[PDB]
């Protein structure tokens, strides 16, 4: 019933958005919900944010 | 735009009491609100010039 086929592949690049599921190896799973201006993050006396 | 930032067209004067008026600003560039709020907050409690009452001889 069919005598020619075409296959097409499509590539998608995905960043991180609120609601994505994240996990640490020690069973510590959680969903992320925020993206902050880097200024807001707590930072050390050496000026490095987390 | 490369060196221009949005500025607020501010309207709120709500003096629920004359001693405190509720004010509001909008719009501000992303994140400036914390910067401005913290700066003015620190100014208002610490920096204001004023007269104070401190003495009792009795």
From Swiss-Prot, chain A:
It comes from the Bacteria. Coiled coil: none annotated. Acetylated on several lysine residues in the presence of glucose. Co-administration of salinamide and rifampicin or salinamide and myxopyronin suppresses the emergence of resistance to both antibiotics. The RNAP catalytic core consists of 2 alpha, 1 beta, 1 beta' and 1 omega subunit. When a sigma factor is associated with the core the holoenzyme is formed, which can initiate transcription. The rRNA transcription and antitermination complex (rrnTAC) consists of RNAP, NusA, NusB, NusE (rpsJ), NusG, SubB, ribosomal protein S4, DNA and precursor rRNA; S4 is more flexible than other subunits. In pull-down experiments interacts with CedA. (Microbial infection) Interacts (via flap domain) with Escherichia phage lambda antitermination protein Q; this interaction renders bacterial RNAP resistant to transcription pausing and allows it to read through termination signals. Belongs to the RNA polymerase beta chain family. DNA-dependent RNA polymerase (RNAP) catalyzes the transcription of DNA into RNA using the four ribonucleoside triphosphates as substrates. This is DNA-directed RNA polymerase subunit beta. It comes from Escherichia coli (strain K12). The chain holds residues 1045 to 1094 of 1342 of the full protein.
UniProtKB/Swiss-Prot annotation, chain B:
Coiled coil: none annotated. (Microbial infection) ADP-ribosylated on both alpha subunits by the phage T4 protein ModA. ADP-ribosylated on only one of the alpha subunits by the phage T4 protein Alt. It comes from the Bacteria. DNA-dependent RNA polymerase (RNAP) catalyzes the transcription of DNA into RNA using the four ribonucleoside triphosphates as substrates. This subunit plays an important role in subunit assembly since its dimerization is the first step in the sequential assembly of subunits to form the holoenzyme. The N-terminal domain is essential for RNAP assembly and basal transcription, whereas the C-terminal domain is involved in interaction with transcriptional regulators (such as CRP) and with upstream promoter elements. Homodimer. The RNAP catalytic core consists of 2 alpha, 1 beta, 1 beta' and 1 omega subunit. When a sigma factor is associated with the core the holoenzyme is formed, which can initiate transcription. Both the N- and C-terminus interact with different regions of transcriptional regulator CRP. The rRNA transcription and antitermination complex (rrnTAC) consists of RNAP, NusA, NusB, NusE (rpsJ), NusG, SubB, ribosomal protein S4, DNA and precursor rRNA; S4 is more flexible than other subunits. Belongs to the RNA polymerase alpha chain family. This is DNA-directed RNA polymerase subunit alpha. It comes from Escherichia coli (strain K12).
């Amino acid at each position: 019933g069919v005598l020619k086929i075409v296959k097409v592949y499509l590539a998608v690049k995905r960043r991180i958005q609120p609601g994505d599921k994240m996990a640490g190896r020690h069973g510590n799973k959680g969903v992320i919900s925020k993206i902050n201006p880097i200024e807001d993050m707590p930072y050390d006396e050496n000026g490095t944010p987390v | 735009s490369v060196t221009e930032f949005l500025k607020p067209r501010l309207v709120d004067i709500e003096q629920v009491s004359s001693t405190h008026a509720k004010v509001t600003l909008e719009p501000l560039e992303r994140g400036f609100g914390h910067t401005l709020g913290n700066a003015l907050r620190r100014i208002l409690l610490s920096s204001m010039p004023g007269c104070a009452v401190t003495e009792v001889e009795i």
